[PDB]
Amino acid sequence: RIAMAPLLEYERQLVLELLDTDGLVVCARGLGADRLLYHFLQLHCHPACLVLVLNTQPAEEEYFINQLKIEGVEHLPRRVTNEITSNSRYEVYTQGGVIFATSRILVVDFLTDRIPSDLITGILVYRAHRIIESCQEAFILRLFRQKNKRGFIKAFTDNAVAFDTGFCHVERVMRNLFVRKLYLWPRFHVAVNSFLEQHKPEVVEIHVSMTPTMLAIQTAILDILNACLKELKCHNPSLEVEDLSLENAIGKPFDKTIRHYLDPLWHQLGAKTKSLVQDLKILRTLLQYLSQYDCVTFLNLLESLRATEKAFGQNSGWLFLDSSTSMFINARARVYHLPDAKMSKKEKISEKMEGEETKKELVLESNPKWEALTEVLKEIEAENKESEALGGPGQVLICASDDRTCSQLRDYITLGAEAFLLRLYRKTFLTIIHPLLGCSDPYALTRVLHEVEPRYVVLYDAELTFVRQLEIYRASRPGKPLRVYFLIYGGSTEEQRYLTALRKEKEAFEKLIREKASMVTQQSIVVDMREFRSELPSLIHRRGIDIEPVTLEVGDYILTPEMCVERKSISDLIGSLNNGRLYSQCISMSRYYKRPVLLIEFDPSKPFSLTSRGALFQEISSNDISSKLTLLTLHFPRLRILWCPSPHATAELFEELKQSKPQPDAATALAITADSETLPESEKYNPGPQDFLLKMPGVNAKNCRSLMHHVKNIAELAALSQDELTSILGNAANAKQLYDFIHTSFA
Amino acid sequence: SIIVSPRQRGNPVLKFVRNVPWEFGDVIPDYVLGQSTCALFLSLRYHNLHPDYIHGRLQSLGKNFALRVLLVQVDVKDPQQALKELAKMCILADCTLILAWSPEEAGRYLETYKAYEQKPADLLMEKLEQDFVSRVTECLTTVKSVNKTDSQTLLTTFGSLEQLIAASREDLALCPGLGPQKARRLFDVLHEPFLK
């Protein structure tokens, strides 16, 4: 009895629909969507048939692998990675079964046609929300649909919010995923509610009122954030949807909308917004820092923000850290007392005037979650104790957001409340606890849940994904009702963060149902691996010119025996013209190949003028993009520039350009390489210290290889003397340079 | 000393140059810029009028100068065809296509091509690599995802590589806004054995 094991009746239907007609199933916030996949995998997992699972991640494999192993099925799923001896070595496909894979390692096999495409029986995608942007997967599928007869696709998926986003109609995702039907399945559905009521877990919502001096921090932080967002909105009229109001800047998925909206053409923003976005990120992580951590650390963190002015100037801004000083005074009250002096004397009240010799001491305060926790854990022992043997021993697995909290909480009980204030203040001058979330394996807490059957469970503020997981854990009907105890700060950020997002889902699923109810001689081009992440190879392949994939070192495409194209957009041009790497690139391209070009893609809606107009009206026109472009074209007489308006035009311009020329060959294209880099198997952990050790002052490749081959790790370089280093290297000046670098302070 | 050939009398670009004086002289390309640098000026609305005017003019120039320049100025709202024609009609005749978005920008191009014969003052990407704080922020950023600002806030807590190399994993876990993942990454990096 492990994991999903026997599926509960509400599931039993869903599997029935997806076994006859293909489609994509939209489940709801971990209501168990994962589980469904287990059932499909076991059924098709027999040895003589195959299927590929498209978009997994490494660790999940582990749980799935081990769980299914327990049942004892043979030919358990095998995993394929890049480091598998490339072609020929991948003979596992022949042997068959289910096979896990990464998005890339596939594309190469299919294009070279090494894999058997005759025999492949179907495709099971996962995390379908990722296929929304036209990236590598689309290619994997449209390439797949030459097995027109047998091949069956399926789209188990989740995270319903993404599809709800404007300008990304599901139908477009639908048409790309090559399936006809649609199977919505939400958590107000008529047959998923009648089953989940027969057995329901009981909540004991407990309201914990916060201190009167916490609101004085929170209503100031929200005011500074509200004053920052308008200034971001004014000097950038482009971003205007789904990143505007205050609601959406409190939740966790906010940075993805900014990283989608401001990544095209980052380098034409200027200097004002580029600091303001960093300000908004640090002001968002401040609001989470205070609630989940102790007061002593927070007084440090706000004081550590003050120290990045007197050495680096405007590091975290000069705009917000010298206004609204109520944050400091609220902050200052927690840990240190105010000044005190007297001698039976009137008019004696000062800011910092000596009677006032001793440092005044202010008692440390404790955020009332720790106080209202200890009522529950002393009730529940009596709910044990009174039950004596009759109730049973019981177990509790109290849970928390992040690892550091778990550390503190652990201590708050183990030592005592006054212990922390004494222990922390010093330095600066039954009961299992596991953290709720991480970039760590999501499939873990669930393992612990089956691990230690919890009679009573106690939950620090958590996101949906956990709460629902617990109802599904109510699959055993007779087992005594697990009693959860929510905790809520009265009128706060976590309750806001919870409630909004819960409402966000509710609108989200609803719009879907209204859209379901409305339906009724050939050439070649050598292609560089790294470039597959962009829509241009998917537009080349449609016109008929065939593509073969391998790594490169000089240029993006090779259209013909004498041409070499290095594609760069309008922002990467501004970047690589001031960074200084295109000049170290064309010097190699014109050396190696005959006639080098470069392809510049502007945009016909918003033309960046590439010149400051007032400086053009005043100055001598130096230090801009245009002057550094002209200085680049002045040296090379043989460079060619091709301007193109859109990525649909590049696929036309390529087919017109190789009209009568021969066909560039793969042979020795990899051979040209370049002359550097030595040999990489020298260090068992080569890919780590080297990258550092080379950037250190005083080194070369030869001395580095020898010295690294002599001493063990990069700790003893600061420990050993300069005489030892100058004896093992035979040089004095660079050795003294290394010893001066490794042993210095900041001043 | 730019030479402007007399076929540019009624032209809207000569009023928008400001830096260096110009001359009138019977040369075959219109704008002669010093030596081995000739320009040719063309608006795409004129290209849609007489379509046989560029292709005739390319032949009479020949292979005289060592750097030829064809600058074109776009003012037509549908440029997705003429540019694709002009690139293929320029590649076989060895010129260089420079696009200008507005008639004021032609003044900056016409002056900038003239007043430049200088040294490679753009080569060294390490043009400012001679100071200590630049060396530590160029050395520390070699790990996977740590930007410059985390290197600043790592500098202003210890300052010493001898102090940083001896701290514990929890001692380096007091990161202002970096995260535990990057701290564990750097704690593995800064001491892991190379060979086996």
Numbering used by the authors:
A (entry chain F): 9 to 362, 366 to 440, 551 to 641, 680 to 906
B (entry chain G): 100 to 295
What does the paper say about this structure?
XPF–ERCC1 recognises double-stranded/single-stranded (ds/ss) DNA junctions which have a 3′-ssDNA overhang, nicking the dsDNA backbone to produce a substrate for subsequent steps in DNA repair pathways. XPF–ERCC1 activity is essential for removing helical DNA distortions arising from ultraviolet-induced damage and bulky adducts as part of the nucleotide excision repair (NER) pathway. XPF is the enzymatically active subunit of the heterodimeric XPF–ERCC1 endonuclease and is comprised of a helicase-like module (HLM) and a catalytic module (CM). The smaller ERCC1 subunit has no catalytic activity but is structurally related to the XPF CM, consisting of a nuclease-like domain (NLD) and a dsDNA-binding (HhH)2 domain.
A single particle cryo-electron microscopy (cryo-EM) density map of purified recombinant XPF–ERCC1 complex (128 kDa) was determined at a global resolution of 4.0 Å enabling the assignment of XPF–ERCC1 domain organisation. Local resolution analysis indicated that the heterodimeric 2×(HhH)2 domain exhibited some mobility, so signal subtraction of this domain was carried out followed by local refinement. This process improved the global resolution of the resulting sub-volume to 3.6 Å which enabled building, refinement and validation of an atomic model. The cryo-EM structure of near full-length XPF–ERCC1 reveals a compact conformation with extensive interactions between the XPF HLM and CM modules. The two RecA-like domains form a rigid platform and lack a nucleotide cleft characteristic of many ATP-driven helicases. While RecA1 caps one edge of the HLM and engages the XPF nuclease domain in the CM, the helical domain caps the other HLM extremity and engages the CM and the dsDNA-binding ERCC1 (HhH)2 domain. The XPF helical domain forms a contact with the XPF nuclease domain that sterically prevents the ds/ssDNA substrate from reaching the XPF active site. A key contact within this auto-inhibited conformation is between sidechains of H275XPF and S730XPF. A second autoinhibitory interface exists between the XPF helical domain and the ERCC1 (HhH)2 domain. This interface is formed through predominantly polar contacts involving the highly conserved T248ERCC1, T252ERCC1 residues and both S312XPF and T316XPF. The structure of DNA-free XPF–ERCC1 reveals how the heterodimer is auto-inhibited by blocking both DNA binding and active site access through contacts with the XPF helical domain.
